[PDB]
Automatic annotation (TrEMBL), chain A:
Signal peptide residues on this chain, from the entry's feature table: none
Quaternary data: The precursor of protein E3/E2 and E1 form a heterodimer shortly after synthesis.
Protein name: Structural polyprotein
Subcellular location: Host cell membrane; Host cytoplasm; Host nucleus; Virion membrane
From TrEMBL, chain B:
Superkingdom, taxonomy of origin: Viruses
Cysteine-cysteine disulfides: 16-121, 19-25, 91-105, 149-263, 198-223, 200-217
Carbohydrate attachment residues: 193
Intracellular or extracellular location(s): Host cell membrane; Host cytoplasm; Host nucleus; Virion membrane
Protein name (Swiss-Prot/TrEMBL): Structural polyprotein
Subunit description: The precursor of protein E3/E2 and E1 form a heterodimer shortly after synthesis.
Entire-sequence positions represented here: 320 to 622 of 1236
UniProtKB/TrEMBL annotation, chain D:
Name of the protein in its database record: Structural polyprotein
Full-protein positions shown: 991 to 1087 of 1236
Origin superkingdom: Viruses
Assembly, per entry: The precursor of protein E3/E2 and E1 form a heterodimer shortly after synthesis.
Compartments where found: Host cell membrane; Host cytoplasm; Host nucleus; Virion membrane
Length: 96, 300, 91, 97, 48, 49, 91
């Protein structure tokens, strides 16, 4: 399972910003113009209708991936390791 | 660089979609994520409020912190015995820690947390009763096989991961404006350095400790103000504005590790076999669903 | 998302807030957008003026009886958009 | 090579590796409501979609009836062919005619 | 006027009960072309 | 002629008759947890079937 | 399935019981048996010494806060065994 963690928005108030291409996993980033945000306490930008929001998203292993994970293997030719018992002359001999 | 000191960290208001009033709201408790990977039905919840810590931040079990949406937007503390978790019926609070909860829950299509006496918040999460083996049961029986499974640890000092933490950005209070008679001012609360960066006619950035006239802002809709001394860390939830510096200032533990354990699974009724030529007729009795797997002992 | 505040036992018609000024909606086109209180989120203690876009007190606020804050939703048409107001009562 | 909603949608060399790679079909959308949330949509994890129809494992679907164990990966007690044995009996067991 | 969870009956009672109960199959209702348990933050804001 | 998991698996000439005869497929199992219970597993009632 | 008892306001490290001696399990193979408390049944007041297999007091037992008894579970591997211990707190 991925965690698809979403970082905090990058909001600036009527200045055009773009985001650099990060190398983090499944990095999807977009810019939204004409935003005018509201979190608790009212308007977050003074400037009226040209503000820019930056939305960021990338994936990461879930905290429970230490147990709930699948490992992909490539399997080549196999070799045997057989264990024998040899009872020659009523003398038991166990070997591998 | 994992830190267990919660004095450097504040809770945050989280915007969540289903409050008690059947509408999204900013709440002191907000469910960021819910994990259900244990085999006993225990779910781990990440909540915007801290648990088991007092307002200063010291380790104080049965009292929890929350950032309140009242007039004095600061950290407040409250009793842990008036908090409820529920999915369809009430959930048994197995454990708690800062930003994290762990509970046995009945099956349901949603998970909600509330602070009774209400500030409930609900998220969509489909949790069901889970197997451990190849036979279905409500609860494990007295007679079983005791197979290995994995459950969430109830001890809070183990670590299933880590969460990155960052400094909090501007918050831009509305109650810091005095639009009156065509001219606007700032309300500094008790002479604090609430700063301002705003665009009356051009970008003007300053720090005021007293009530200050503005040079060119006519209405209050084009100028904001916010506090500056905010050196308390916060989780990188998508419900807050990041600062200009958004590095990993600290890392908190993710408690309730998925520890392996033993747990009993039932044994079904032993089937009776009738032998006919090249084949067997198995007579099967199973009150609950039970898996039968057959395979030929040859090439195919 | 609009956090407003009122005092205790405020009279009828007293100021609670200005919804249109804080949301940036134009006042002289509020009537064309059908500015109305959402019927789901109605508070009997507070009303709003359709013409002026101002939220004010209808009934005298009883702190003991209502408790814990009030929630009121508004909606506008063409384009269709709702907004939320949370009102604190002081003691 | 990754496909959204399929097994191996997110891959890495190890569990704690820094070089995580994934191609989940994630898209960010415009915030319709005037708040500060990040609205996003994304394809479902291919891990859960593989667990939904993983079928039966090799411990139940395997020829010649031999059981699969892990750490290390092995198939114990298989019965299919014949082993040529060249065995040198010591002369202490051989007795006079 | 009451908001209720889905159920097959409606009961009104006076606690402390003189309750009364009738058959009424109520189900969770929709507005659009998507099942949703509760309305989400991001949406289309249709007329209902 | 009793058989388990079918009609007539328990039989008597009367409800109060002491001579009750039955052949339900019941088996007693070794107790796993170290308590004093009696772990048993029985075929389902052919009356209810 | 074991029953132990503690007095009120006991200090840290005081004796409660011997799980391995009561269950008949030998002490010297407890490390090979994988002796450990079950991650589900854990209490913040009582712990166990794994080398000696002795259940004792970790935190001072608050009679008012915990109430009504304390439940603990232990488990061992090869053979896979699970055992349960119930502790009474006096007043
Ligand atoms: C506020 O800022 C001023 C800037 O000159 C500084 O001198 C002062 O110490 C700060 N703090 C107060 C007044 O608490
Ligand atoms: C896949 O999961 C769905 C739940 O969405 C379930 O109904 C179905 O039985 C599962 N299996 C298959 C083969 O579709
Ligand atoms: C086989 O058994 C005989 C008699 O029991 C014994 O004397 C002899 O030592 C055994 N064979 C060998 C090769 O040791």
């Amino acid at each position: 399972k991925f965690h698809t963690v979403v970082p905090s928005p990058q909001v600036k108030c009527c200045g055009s910003l773009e985001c650099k291409a990060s190398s983090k996993a499944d990095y999807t980033c977009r810019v939204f113009g004409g935003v005018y945000p509201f979190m608790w306490g009212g308007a977050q930008c003074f400037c009226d209708s040209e503000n820019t929001q930056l939305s960021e998203a990338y994936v990461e292993f879930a905290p429970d991936c230490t147990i709930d994970h699948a490992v992909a293997l490539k399997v080549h030719t196999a070799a045997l390791k057989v264990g024998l018992r040899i009872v020659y002359g009523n003398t038991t001999a166990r070997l591998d | 660089s994992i830190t267990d000191d919660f004095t450097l960290t504040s809770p945050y208001l989280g915007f969540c979609p289903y409050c008690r009033h059947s509408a999204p709201c900013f709440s002191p408790i907000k469910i960021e994520n819910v994990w259900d990977e244990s085999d006993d039905g225990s779910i781990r919840i990440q909540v915007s409020a801290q648990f088991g810590y007092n307002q200063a931040g010291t380790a104080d079990v049965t009292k929890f912190r929350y950032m309140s949406y009242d007039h004095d937007h600061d950290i407040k503390e409250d009793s842990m015995e008036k908090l409820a978790i529920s999915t369809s019926g009430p959930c048994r609070r197995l454990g708690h820690k800062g930003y994290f909860l762990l509970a046995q829950c009945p099956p349901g299509d949603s998970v909600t947390v509330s602070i009774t006496s209400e500030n409930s918040c609900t998220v969509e999460k489909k949790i069901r009763r889970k197997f451990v083996g190849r036979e279905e049961y409500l609860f494990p029986p007295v007679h079983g096989k005791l197979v290995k499974c994995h459950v969430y640890d109830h001890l809070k000092e183990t670590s299933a991961g880590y969460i990155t933490m960052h400094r909090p950005g501007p918050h831009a209070y509305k109650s810091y404006l005095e639009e009156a008679s065509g001219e606007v001012y700032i309300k500094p609360p008790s002479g604090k350095n609430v700063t301002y960066e705003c665009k009356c006619g051009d970008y003007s950035t300053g720090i005021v400790s007293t009530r200050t006239k503005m040079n060119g802002c006519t209405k209050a809709k084009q100028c904001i103000a916010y506090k500056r001394d905010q050196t308390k860390w916060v989780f990188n939830s998508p419900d807050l504005i990041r600062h200009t510096d958004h590095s990993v200032q600290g890392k908190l533990h993710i408690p309730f590790r998925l520890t392996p354990t033993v747990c009993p699974v039932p044994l079904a009724h032993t089937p009776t076999v009738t032998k006919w030529f090249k084949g067997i007729t198995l007579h099967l009795t199973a009150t609950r669903p039970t898996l039968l797997t057959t395979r030929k002992l040859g090439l195919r | 998302q609009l956090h407003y505040t009122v005092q205790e036992e405020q009279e009828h018609g007293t100021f609670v807030g200005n919804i249109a000024e804080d949301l940036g909606l134009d006042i002289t086109k509020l009537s064309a957008r059908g500015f109305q209180t959402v019927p789901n989120s109605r508070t009997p203690y507070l009303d709003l003026n359709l013409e002026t876009g101002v939220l004010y007190v209808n009934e005298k606020i009883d702190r003991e009886q209502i408790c814990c804050v009030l929630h009121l939703e508004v909606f506008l048409e063409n384009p269709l958009e709702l907004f939320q107001v949370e009102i604190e009562v002081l003691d | 090579a990754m496909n959204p909603g399929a097994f191996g949608d997110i891959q890495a060399s190890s569990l704690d590796a820094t070089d995580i790679v994934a191609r989940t079909d994630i898209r960010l959308l415009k915030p319709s409501v005037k708040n500060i949330h990040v609205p996003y949509t994304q394809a479902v994890s291919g891990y859960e979609m593989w667990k939904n129809n993983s079928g039966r494992p090799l411990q139940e679907t395997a020829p010649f009836g031999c059981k699969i164990e892990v750490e290390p990966l092995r198939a114990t007690n298989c019965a299919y062919g014949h082993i040529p044995i060249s065995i040198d009996i010591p002369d202490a067991a051989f007795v006079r005619s």
